[PDB]
Amino acid sequence: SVVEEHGQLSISNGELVNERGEQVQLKGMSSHGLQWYGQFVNYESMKWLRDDWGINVFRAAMYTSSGGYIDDPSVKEKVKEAVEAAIDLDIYVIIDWHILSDNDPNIYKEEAKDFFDEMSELYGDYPNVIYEIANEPNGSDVTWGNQIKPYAEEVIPIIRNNDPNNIIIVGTGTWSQDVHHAADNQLADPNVMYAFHFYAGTHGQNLRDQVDYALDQGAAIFVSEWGTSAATGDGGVFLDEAQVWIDFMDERNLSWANWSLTHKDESSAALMPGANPTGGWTEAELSPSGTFVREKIRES
Numbered sequence: 001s002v003v004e005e006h007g008q009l010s011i012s013n014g015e016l017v018n019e020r021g022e023q024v025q026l027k028g029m030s031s032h033g034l035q036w037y038g039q040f041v042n043y044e045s046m047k048w049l050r051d052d053w054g055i056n057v058f059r060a061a062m063y064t065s066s067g068g069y070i071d072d073p074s075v076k077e078k079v080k081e082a083v084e085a086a087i088d089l090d091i092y093v094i095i096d097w098h099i100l101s102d103n104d105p106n107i108y109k110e111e112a113k114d115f116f117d118e119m120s121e122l123y124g125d126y127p128n129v130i131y132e133i134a135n136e137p138n139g140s141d142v143t144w145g146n147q148i149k150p151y152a153e154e155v156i157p158i159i160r161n162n163d164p165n166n167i168i169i170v171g172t173g174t175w176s177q178d179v180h181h182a183a184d185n186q187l188a189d190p191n192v193m194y195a196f197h198f199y200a201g202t203h204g205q206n207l208r209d210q211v212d213y214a215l216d217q218g219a220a221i222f223v224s225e226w227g228t229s230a231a232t233g234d235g236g237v238f239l240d241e242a243q244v245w246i247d248f249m250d251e252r253n254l255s256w257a258n259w260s261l262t263h264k265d266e267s268s269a270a271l272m273p274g275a276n277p278t279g280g281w282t283e284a285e286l287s288p289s290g291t292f293v294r295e296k297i298r299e300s
């Protein structure tokens, strides 16, 4: 009864809080690309994650390019399936417009506005929804002030016309790591959070200090994607550094979603090759990454 209990989320003094003003921390899983591993996103697998892992949020990663929504828009119905399952399971759900190779969010901004108009019209009167309008802006030519902020200032009004105050997570520069620039030039909407993403394969001490800098400017931060692997999503599992970041996020009350729920043979994948797409996984069906992430959420 997560959503019944916490209900309407909002941002108060840079912190995510529930409808009674208490701090709340979401912890859950992100799908991998819905165009590739959509079979793992369904009511049964999400219910298994809720009941066995303890998740209270699920992120639907709808890639825009790389065979995603722009090339085949049918994937938006898998996002609707995920949202409806989250509503039925009474957990939160992040609708992620998952830019990556299309590194500037302005590339498909017209399509983004139409997509977020549709999603906010359909689900804007449910408290479960969190909109993530640009996964990972990247590249030297994509900056907060020139590209990302103006993009957000076109897409947020579209959402706000249908849904006045559910949370909106906005990506930051350099694959959603540059929270320092966003925190010094914040958006006006009071229920916005800035995305911060990390990979445990990278030594993270300065990145933690940079998150703290942003928090000190009153910016709210959502760790909408992080992995136990290197920045490519593979290259080994780095659980010592992952635990440092888990503890950091608990101390700072940061919400998070781990990448990712798939059986792909890469270190960040949570499942092994024979895992059932509808849930019920044994210990042997969870990868080293999945076992750790499950433990962290169950401990919570």
Ligand SMILES: OC[C@H]1O[C@@H](O[C@H]2[C@H](O)[C@@H](O)[C@H](O[C@H]3[C@H](O)[C@@H](O)[C@@H](O)O[C@@H]3CO)O[C@@H]2CO)[C@H](O)[C@@H](O)[C@@H]1O
Binding pocket: 036, 066, 100, 135, 136, 175, 197, 225, 231, 232, 233, 234, 259, 264, 266, 268
């Ligand atoms: O097998 C499907 C498809 O995978 C593509 O590689 C993926 C990695 O598997 C995935 O882990 C990685 O995820 C990135 C996520 O999208 C970003 O937001 C981010 O923070 O980094 C994550 C890990 O780097 O994305 C890549 C690229 O989409 C293969 O490239 C492709 O050939 C294959 O079909």
